[PDB]
Design a protein around this ligand. Structure first.
Ligand SMILES: CCCCCCCCCCCCCCCCCC(=O)OC[C@H](COP(=O)([O-])OCC[N+](C)(C)C)OC(=O)CCCCCCCCCCCCCCCCC
Ligand SMILES: CCCCCCCCCCC[C@H](O)CC(=O)SCCNC(=O)CCNC(=O)[C@H](O)C(C)(C)COP(=O)(O)O
Ligand code: SF4
Ligand code: SF4
Ligand code: SF4
Lengths: 176, 115, 85, 155, 115
């Protein structure tokens, strides 16, 4: 099924022709436009008072990355390199080795946040919920170099944001 | 098959004729390029650059390769004439920023592993 | 008046000795550009331009390649502009 | 002393310069639409004095919103040069920051900071309109702490 | 004369605003900064771009209409004559001739912005 958008012929009688002449000479549809703008002037604006008010987000929101720990304080990352393998932008650089206690742990874990596309594939690939994208989205920097994250930087991000990261994960893990 | 079809030229003399026409066009264009793009080079420098670009391909014997080289040269000439290229594009034939690379064995040995 | 044969020969001579790779002392009436003066066909193409900006008219590729000796340019110019001294 | 007057004058000029940050719409790619979303009613960048401006001759900040390609970089540098001073550059999105998804491409310049000096790097692909607004307010706070007249007084 | 003082004050204050506007800012200018603006590239000078007979024709037709308007301006005092029928006849005559000029320009292409 289809429909025509502009297949109406105007009526050609006295009253219709006079209606169109009055519309031509008295600018009635221009007055309708003025009325629409005037009606919008008396509507409450949709503006929010940033930064005192914030745009609404969801637990699934993909922001700044973080490396997480177990309740014991032990790191979750066991350096499987799945996130580095799946990373569409090749933003993840990993080096690992046996730790002094024998654990399988990273010695390098870099994310080039200027290479990153913030797709969240890394946190999908991760089998232990080690790498996540956190809720933070206000981390603009004055230099390019502060956006090339380190393992220390990402672990400090995890320690900084774990309280709300864990709540978001608890909110959404049953969908995953 | 044993033989192949031409691009334009059925022979090497035809390819040379078109090469000469393209060289003529480029040689006449160079002064207008120097003036219009406000290049800081001389017309002698630009025409010597045109000649040196032509001389890179002097070893070509295949008339089809010569024809495609002429096609690409005419394309470049039309980018230059119509001012589709910027000054930076015209000045890229002159690698003014790149440092003089070594050529002899000893300096290449000193600076790294590349042959 | 239509410039005579020597009125073409001297112009050819001057524009030929303005060319860098052509030595004035090695340049003669019949100094063939390639074998005598040691030039390329790109050099010949370049000098043919210098025969176009002076004499006004345009020499096309079909016969501009035929202009090897400085006398041959003179004869071509004389023929083209209906010059018969 | 006379350094109090210079400090007050610097404060005045830097309040006037950050209260009328007029940016130039350099919308190259997907980051352009989140920036006009920061323009949209929900965030209303005009309420901060940040107007919708025009030709670089009346622009104070360049927002590089999108991938910069090799074919496009000379134009970006040209319009950056044509901006009157003081002028600032905000790099918005991964592509403008360091190449992003297209970092390893033959035709993409890896970060606009190879072409222009950048004041603020807004991360994200794309950064949300709120993230770009945060970057803009951070740029405003950068302007607040400039000491141009105090530098001059101690020269 | 009060009006002369008023004009002097207006012109003087406008020029003073120029002087503050055009000397107070701190400057640092280079060649590529003041280059003519062409949306990220360089402009072509070409040769006398502002052409087309239509721009000149609208100016000429405005000139002639403005002359007839100059003929119409004395009308508020013209209605104060005892010989009102002659004055009305002549004012309406002038307005019919204005309408006739408009109609003749209209019908003979004239006011059109053609291909
Ligand atoms: C409507 C408007 C009506 C008029 C409003 C007038 C408002 C006057 C208040 C102050 C205005 C700005 C003054 C400073 C100019 C901008 C600035 O920061 O300059 C820094 C510059 C910095 O100079 P600098 O020498 O340190 O650096 C220049 C060289 N480079 C850039 C390479 C480093 O200051 C000056 O050049 C000297 C300023 C002298 C003091 C001026 C006081 C105000 C005078 C007018 C009253
Ligand atoms: C403004 C600044 C500069 C900005 C612009 C700088 C670049 C300008 C030129 C751009 C084009 C470039 O030269 C490539 C082309 O057109 S390549 C044509 C083919 N080229 C050959 O070489 C064919 C085989 N060659 C021979 O057969 C002979 O060796 C030769 C013809 C050379 C001499 O013949 P002769 O009879 O000895
Ligand atoms: S969010 Fe995507 S692009 Fe960024 S590090 Fe993770 S996998 Fe790589
Ligand atoms: S963060 Fe997760 S996916 Fe990446 S190496 Fe560590 S355990 Fe593997
Ligand atoms: S950073 Fe992401 S959203 Fe922005 S232009 Fe590049 S690919 Fe598009």
């Amino acid at each position: 099924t289809y429909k025509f958008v502009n297949m109406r012929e105007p009526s050609m009688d006295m009253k219709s022709v006079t209606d169109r002449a009055a519309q031509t000479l008295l600018w009635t549809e221009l007055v309708r436009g003025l009325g629409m703008t005037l009606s919008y002037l008396f509507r409450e604006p949709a503006t929010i008072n940033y930064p005192f008010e914030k745009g609404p987000l969801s637990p699934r929101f993909r922001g700044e990355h973080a490396l997480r720990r177990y309740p014991s304080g032990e790191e979750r990352c066991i350096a499987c390199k799945l996130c580095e393998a799946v990373c569409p932008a090749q933003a993840i650089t990993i080096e690992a080795e046996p730790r002094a206690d024998g654990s399988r742990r990273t010695t390098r874990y870099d994310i080039d946040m200027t290479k990153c596309i913030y797709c969240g594939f890394c946190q999908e690939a991760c089998p232990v919920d080690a790498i996540v994208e956190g809720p933070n989205f206000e981390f603009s920097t004055e230099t390019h170099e502060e956006l090339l994250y380190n393992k220390e930087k990402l672990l400090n991000n995890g320690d900084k944001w774990e309280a709300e990261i864990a709540a978001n994960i608890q909110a959404d893990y049953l969908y995953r | 098959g044993t033989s192949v079809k031409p691009i334009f030229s059925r022979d090497m003399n035809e390819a040379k004729r078109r090469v000469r026409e393209l060289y003529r066009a480029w040689y006449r264009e160079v002064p207008n390029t120097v003036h219009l793009f406000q290049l800081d080079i001389s017309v002698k420098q630009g025409r010597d650059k045109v000649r040196e670009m032509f001389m890179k391909n002097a070893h070509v014997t295949d008339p089809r390769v010569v024809d495609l080289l002429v096609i690409k040269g005419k394309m470049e000439l039309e980018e230059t004439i119509n001012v589709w290229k910027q000054r930076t594009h015209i000045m890229r034939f002159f690698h003014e920023t790149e440092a003089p690379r070594p050529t002899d064995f000893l300096s290449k040995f000193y600076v790294g592993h590349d042959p | 008046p239509p410039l005579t044969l020597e009125a073409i020969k001297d112009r050819v001579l001057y524009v030929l000795k303005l060319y860098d790779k052509i030595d004035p002392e090695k340049l003669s009436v019949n100094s063939h550009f390639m074998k005598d003066l040691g030039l390329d066909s790109l050099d010949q193409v370049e000098i043919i331009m210098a025969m176009e900006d002076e004499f006004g008219f345009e020499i096309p590729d079909i016969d501009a390649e035929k202009l090897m000796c400085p006398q041959e340019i003179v004869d071509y110019i004389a023929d083209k502009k209906d010059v018969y001294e | 002393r006379g350094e109090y007057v210079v400090a007050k004058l610097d404060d005045l000029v830097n309040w006037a310069r950050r209260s009328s940050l007029w940016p130039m719409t350099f919308g190259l790619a997907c980051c352009a639409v989140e920036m006009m979303h920061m323009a949209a009613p929900r965030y209303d960048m005009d309420r901060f004095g940040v107007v919708f401006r025009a030709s670089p001759r009346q622009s104070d900040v360049m927002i590089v919103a999108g991938t910069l390609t090799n074919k496009m970089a000379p134009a970006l540098r040209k319009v950056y040069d044509q901006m009157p001073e003081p002028r600032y550059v905000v790099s918005m999105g991964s592509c403008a920051n360091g190449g992003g998804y297209y970092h390893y491409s033959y035709s993409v310049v890896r970060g606009c900071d190879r072409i222009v000096p950048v004041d603020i790097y807004v991360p994200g692909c794309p950064p949300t309109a709120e993230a770009l607004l945060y970057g803009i307010l951070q740029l405003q706070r950068k302007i607040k702490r400039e000491k141009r007249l105090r530098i001059w007084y101690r020269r | 004369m009060n009006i002369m003082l008023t004009l002097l004050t207006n012109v003087t204050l406008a020029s003073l605003l120029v002087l503050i506007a055009f000397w107070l800012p701190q400057l640092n200018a280079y060649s590529e900064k003041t280059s003519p603006y062409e949306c990220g590239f360089d402009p072509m000078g070409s040769a006398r771009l502002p052409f087309s007979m239509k721009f000149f024709l609208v100016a000429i037709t405005f000139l002639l209409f403005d002359l007839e308007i100059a003929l119409l301006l004395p009308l508020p005092w013209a209605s104060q004559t005892n010989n009102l029928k002659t004055m009305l006849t002549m004012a309406l005559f002038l307005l019919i001739l204005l309408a006739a000029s408009l109609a003749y320009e209209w019908t003979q292409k004239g006011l059109e912005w053609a291909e």
